[PDB]
Structures are given as C-alpha cells and as structure tokens.
C-alpha cells in the first residue's frame, strides 16, 4: 500500500521483493522494502524457534 501511494506495485520474486514504477524508487520506500524483507527473514527464524 505505501508503495502504491507512491505509484509502485510490490512485485515478488521469492522472499525478495522489487518495486514497479517510473524512475528510481524513493529512499524511504526502498528502506521499507529491505525492512520488510529482513523482518520476514527474522520472523521465519523466530517462527522456527
């Protein structure tokens, strides 16, 4: 959602994610991107534990 307000679609390749839209993505939205991917990794690990 916070990507689509910025005019980007959240494309999935796996657990890794990219953004679809014109030009380079904003720094904050990319930050949120790596944030959610790292958080998903950590959440999977703590799911295991």
């Amino acid at each position: 959602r916070e990507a689509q307000e910025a005019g980007f679609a959240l494309s999935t390749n796996g657990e890794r994610l990219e953004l679809t839209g014109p030009g380079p993505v904003p720094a904050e939205l990319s930050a949120r991107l790596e944030e959610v991917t790292l958080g998903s990794l950590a959440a999977s690990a703590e799911l295991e534990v």
């Binding site: 720094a27 990319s30 930050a31 949120r32 790596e34 944030e35």
Partner: protein, 49 residues
C-alpha cells in the same frame, strides 16, 4: 557472579544489534547512503555518456 550475568546479557545483545539493523531509522540511513553512492555513480556514468 553479577559480572557473569551481565556478560550473559551482553552476549545476548547480538540479537538486539541484529534487530537494530532491521529497524526503520538505521535502514533509512543505509538507504540514503547507497542512494548517494548510486546517484554519484549515475552522475559519473552520465558525464561519460
């Protein structure tokens, strides 16, 4: 014994460090960093082009 337990807490602080590196603020800083670097590389590449 108190030093031993404090060191146990400190050794656990590795997970706090990792979760800090997943936080929003640090990730925003990191993305601003590589964004400056990428735009500088783009500036060089575009001068060359």
């Amino acid at each position: 014994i108190h030093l031993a337990e404090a060191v146990e807490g400190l050794l656990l602080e590795v997970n706090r460090l990792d979760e800090l590196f997943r936080q929003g603020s640090f990730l925003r800083e990191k993305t601003q960093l590589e964004a400056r670097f990428k735009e500088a590389r783009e500036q060089q590449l575009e001068a060359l082009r």
